[PDB]
Write a protein that binds this DNA or RNA. Structure first.
Ligand SMILES: [Mg+2]
Lengths: 191, 232, 349, 164, 9
RNA sequence: GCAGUCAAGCGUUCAUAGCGACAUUGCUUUUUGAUUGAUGUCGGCUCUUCCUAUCAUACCGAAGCAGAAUUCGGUAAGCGUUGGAUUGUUCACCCACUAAUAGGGAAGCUGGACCGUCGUGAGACAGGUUAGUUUACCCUACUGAU
RNA sequence: UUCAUCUAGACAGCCGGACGGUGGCCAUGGAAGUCGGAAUCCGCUAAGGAGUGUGUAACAACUCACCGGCCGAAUGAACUA
């Protein structure tokens, strides 16, 4: 309808500080700092206090107002990642050939190395994105934990791990081997 | 143009609309006209068998349930007009799900009955769990290791995805049976019950929380006054 | 014999088949013709179209007709199995419908090419081409129900096992739950499933083992019910026709706890009824769940049945427990040795 | 493997750990993908897509209406029949005759040609065309004897007639 | 009956 | 295709003044799976380039797709896509060979007509006139060279 | 443009209810709303199909049809260009 103005709210908890200048967003909370370059969007940021930040679009169309809520949700994810983090649990399952998963250091960088997937002689390497730490679950079978401030980084790392162990030229009804995202939560789970 | 397509489902029952609310308004007007005592009760998570048991616990008396705003309008919310005097005082105190009991019987008798009546229903979220539960490490059985395991048959394979996804329980299917790698406790005594914790307790189907019919107040057609009785 | 028909090409329904053939024609043949061309060239274009479509239809139909087994000239055991699983007359008439469609398409193709011989314009040639393709499409659409039926038949018969009647087969029957499943999974590595209710597996199951350097096979039945059997459902008719057509040592199982729910009296009656079915076959009767009770210390009331079936010749009696590997191997050894003795007499013949 | 082995395998082992969510997300994307195919398929594939989509919409509308209603409740190159040379392949011996009385269509043979609106010479030659009056045989068996052929046979490759 | 069947085999 | 059947809709608004999308009898036709090729003025080889409507090779999607093999489909023209027989040259087709032996566009030797006669329920005359013109040492393209 | 619903509460979401004869009737080894064929009934209801689908050998469980609480404000459908 070509609205004159549209606004979205962004709440800021008592521990985090948000700096915005020329559509570069820095969120600094208890757990570190995240930076997002939003110059590909056309919005205006304002604040009335230290607890609330408005994102506004003036005289925008359907696509512009569609991007507005996206901007708000991205900043919300930055706040959540800086205050509570993200933890993705993946499980790997097999029938015959046990999948061997290790953290190796190749050329000075972290890699998730997967060996013996469906009996393959091929070594699979998944580079660990910076900011996400990889752990192996205690007292749990075949569970790998990806923890990070950036939900984008954690989710893309889990997606890469899941896609690297695709089953080729077989029946997925019969062959269930693979690494799967078992659960998605936060690094703090008080209740 | 880019719009969500509404789900199209071919089912018999159709939403009734304004006429059903009109008929409820008329029926409560009739009940208040032709009865003496109208009690306001709260029945929040009450099953239809319990509602029917209370319904059949009297034939002369009448139970009316429905929209809170419609009932508050019928009873009277303002001093410009109301069926009887001082009814806004009773109407304001109604809180959640409405229940109207119309009778001519003894106030003490109905109070004693609603005090004595109690039922053990499903546990509910954000409520104290009367008894704790902990799935053992073995093959997962339907009841949950309470009734004789040798008597009962283990959990069906069809519920394993639901438990693994919504109930946040590590589960695997071995030879067709659901199992777990370590004992897993769901809740402790007097602990706030999560939505999923309530779901899992109901999934094992151990109905243990004590449900009761509570009353907030009542009104009479002879003295026309509001008496605050707090029976839980 | 062929012993298997998994090599039947997948059958497509009427609309999918129509899309496949017509789109193949439109892609694999030239599609540009001009009214300003020679009439002979226009005729060649449209005749090639008609002929190509006819060839595609008949080749798909030829695949269909060559794939499915001729249930008439096939081995009698396989014939009865196919009849019990899917009605034989229905199967034959669906195949015959395929054959009629093939013939009709071929005849229409020849006829419309003959008519196109005298094409007088691009318009008339196009009209004749459309008429030929439309007639073929009508035939294929009328062929709908046989295509779906034969697709289901193709899937199921591809999934059927490979039982050779002219082998050393050990047939296993009785009520469900008696221990046929356990016995088969013990003597062979067959993957059947056991549940506490009737007709748990609705199909025959096969397994293999070796004995004295000879490959024997073992068949496990779905289970049989004791009735007048004038009318019966296919699940147990499979077992009946297997017992009839399989030259085997029938190893009938018995229970003394009546865990399946039937009486030992009913088991004896069923065995007495099936006794005339047993022609030049050596029969054994194994009693399972005997760690609780045995014929040795069983009541005389059932001992009357025991002496009656001992009177029945020339079956032999044994009690066994599935846990005892030595006992199950002795059951297997007795059955294999009596099969060897029968074949040794046959070699003397 | 024998019998329903894949279903037995699903019972014994389950499916892949992400099967449910994979199917759900796929069918949620399905609507965007239908729109993308409608706007991005070109040529014959696009035309077929639009045709099948229209058929689906018609089927769903009829289904909803039915549910609600129940709920409420020289050589002559034209076809002939035997100096002028007439090719044999164009000869037609039988036809499909419809009777307007009971609305039935029966396969009835050709015997003679009576009236030809084009030419009495065509009438002599036996040339079949539209609106031509022909004689049929009801020896196969109220019922007539003459039929007016309704369509040009030289296009449709056959003869369709209406019994008078 | 059954004898006829096995004879027909 | 013929006649229909009702209609999603339409028809100057008009339900059977009238039309009409999409969907439903019968055809070579009898059932149990029996016996029931065209092309003569075109065709060869070589050989360039282009299209994709893809036969093979690459990567994907689905399907009782267990495995193996296959079917249908998506992107895709990078790269290829035989030797011989054949009762007229050809293509259908056969023998084999191969990963496959896909279909098309552009596209130099080569293996007639008319005039005239006795006659006509009926044959012949061999009378007469007329035409058949594209088979490098120059310019330019290309390939090399000053 | 025309229909509609709506602060005696609209659309979207969460959480509840989703009942009794009854596992209706016939064939089936079994079929309890959901492999099959026939009317689809009666009561209590705010409201609850002799059932919209997944799901089990049959059950069960979930689900949607429908009604309620939650917060507050317009929303939906069919056509035309
Ligand atoms: Mg059993």
């Amino acid at each position: 309808m070509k609205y004159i103005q549209t606004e979205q709210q962004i709440e800021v908890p008592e521990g985090v500080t948000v700096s915005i200048k020329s559509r570069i967003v820095k969120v600094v909370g208890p757990r570190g700092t995240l930076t997002k370059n939003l110059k590909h969007i056309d919005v205006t940021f304002t604040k009335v206090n230290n607890q609330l930040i408005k994102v506004a679009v003036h005289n925008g169309g359907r696509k512009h107002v569609a991007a507005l809520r996206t901007v708000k949700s991205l900043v919300d994810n930055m706040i959540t990642g800086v205050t509570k983090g993200y933890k993705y649990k993946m499980r790997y399952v097999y029938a015959h050939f046990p999948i061997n998963v290790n953290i190796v250091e190749k050329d000075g960088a972290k890699f998730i190395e997967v060996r013996n997937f469906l009996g393959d002689k091929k070594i699979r390497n998944v580079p660990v994105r910076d900011g996400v730490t990889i752990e192996f679950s205690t007292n749990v079978k075949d569970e790998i934990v990806l923890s990070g401030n950036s939900v984008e980084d954690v989710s893309q790392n889990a997606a890469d791990l899941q896609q690297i162990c695709r089953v080729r030229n077989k029946d997925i009804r019969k062959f269930l081997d693979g690494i799967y995202v078992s659960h998605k939560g936060f690094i703090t789970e008080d209740l | 143009r880019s719009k969500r397509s509404k789900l199209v489902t071919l089912a018999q029952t159709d939403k009734k609309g304004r006429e059903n609310k009109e008929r409820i308004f008329d029926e409560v007007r009739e009940a208040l006209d032709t009865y003496r005592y109208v009690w306001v009760l709260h029945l929040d998570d009450v099953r239809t068998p319990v509602l029917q048991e209370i319904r059949t616990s009297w034939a002369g008396s009448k139970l009316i349930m429905g929209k809170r705003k419609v009932l508050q309008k019928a009873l009277g919310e303002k001093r410009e007009e109301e069926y009887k005097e001082n009814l806004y005082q009773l109407s304001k105190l109604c809180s959640g799900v409405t229940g109207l009991l119309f009778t001519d019987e003894d106030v003490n008798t109905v109070k004693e009955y609603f005090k004595s009546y109690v039922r053990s229903d499903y546990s509910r979220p954000n409520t104290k769990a009367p008894l704790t539960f902990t799935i053992p490490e073995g093959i997962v059985y339907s009841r949950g290791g309470q009734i004789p395991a040798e008597e009962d048959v283990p959990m069906i394979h069809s519920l394993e995805p639901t438990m693994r996804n919504k109930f946040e329980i590590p589960t695997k299917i071995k030879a067709g049976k659901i199992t777990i790698d370590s004992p897993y406790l769901v809740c402790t005594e007097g602990e706030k019950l999560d939505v999923r914790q309530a779901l899992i307790l109901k999934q094992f189907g151990i109905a243990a929380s004590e449900f009761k019919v509570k009353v907030s107040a009542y009104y009479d057609n002879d003295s026309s006054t509001v008496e605050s009785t707090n029976i839980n | 014999m062929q012993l298997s028909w998994k090599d039947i090409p997948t059958v497509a329904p009427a609309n999918d088949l129509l899309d496949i053939v017509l789109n193949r024609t439109q892609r694999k043949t030239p599609t540009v013709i001009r009214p300003g061309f020679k009439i002979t060239r226009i005729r060649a274009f449209y005749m090639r179209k008609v002929k190509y479509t006819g060839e595609g239809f008949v080749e798909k139909f030829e695949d269909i007709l060559k794939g499915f087994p001729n249930i008439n000239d096939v081995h009698p055991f396989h014939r009865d199995l196919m009849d019990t699983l899917y009605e034989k007359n229905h199967y034959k008439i669906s195949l015959a419908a395929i054959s009629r469609a093939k013939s009709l398409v071929e005849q229409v193709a020849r006829d419309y090419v003959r008519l196109l011989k005298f094409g007088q314009s691009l318009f008339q040639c196009k009209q004749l081409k459309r008429a030929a393709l439309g007639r073929m499409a009508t035939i294929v659409k009328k062929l709908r129900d046989p295509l779906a039926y034969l697709e289901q038949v193709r899937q199921h018969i591809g999934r059927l096992p490979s039982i050779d009647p002219n082998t050393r087969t050990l047939l296993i029957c009785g009520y469900p739950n008696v221990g046929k499943s356990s016995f088969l999974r013990c003597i062979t590595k067959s993957d059947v499933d056991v549940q506490p209710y009737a007709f748990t597996t609705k199909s025959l199951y096969v397994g293999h083992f070796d004995y004295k350097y000879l490959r024997f096979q073992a068949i496990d039945t779905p289970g049989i019910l004791d009735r007048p059997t004038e009318e019966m459902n296919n699940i147990e008719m499979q077992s009946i026709y297997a017992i009839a057509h399989l030259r085997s040592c029938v190893l009938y199982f018995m229970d003394l706890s009546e865990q399946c729910g039937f009486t030992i009296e009913a088991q004896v009656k069923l065995f007495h009824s099936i006794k005339p079915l047993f022609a030049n076959k050596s029969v054994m009767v194994v009693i399972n769940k005997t760690d609780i009770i045995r014929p040795e210390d069983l009541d005389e009331e059932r001992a009357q049945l025991l002496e009656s079936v001992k009177e029945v010749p020339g079956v032999e009696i044994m009690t066994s427990s599935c846990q005892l590997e030595e006992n199950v191997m002795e059951v297997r050894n007795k059955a294999c040795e009596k099969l060897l003795a029968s074949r040794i007499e046959n070699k003397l013949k | 493997p024998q019998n329903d082995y894949i279903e037995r395998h699903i019972k014994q082992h389950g499916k892949r750990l992400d099967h449910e969510e994979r199917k759900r997300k796929r069918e949620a994307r399905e609507s965007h993908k239908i729109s993308e195919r409608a706007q991005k398929l070109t040529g014959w594939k696009g035309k077929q897509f639009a045709k099948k989509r229209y058929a689906e919409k018609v089927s769903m509308r009829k289904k909803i209406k039915a549910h609600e209603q129940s709920k409420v409740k020289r050589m002559i190159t034209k076809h002939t029949f035997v100096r002028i040379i007439r090719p044999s392949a164009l000869r037609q011996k039988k036809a499909n005759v419809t009777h307007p009385e009971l609305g039935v269509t029966v396969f009835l043979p050709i015997l003679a040609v009576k009236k030809n609106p084009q030419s009495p010479m065509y009438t002599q030659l036996g040339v079949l065309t539209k609106g031509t009056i022909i004689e049929v045989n009801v020896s196969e068996l109220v019922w007539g004897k003459y039929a007016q052929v309704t369509n040009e046979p030289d296009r449709d490759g056959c003869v369709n007639a209406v019994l008078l | 009956n059954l004898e006829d069947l096995v004879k027909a085999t």
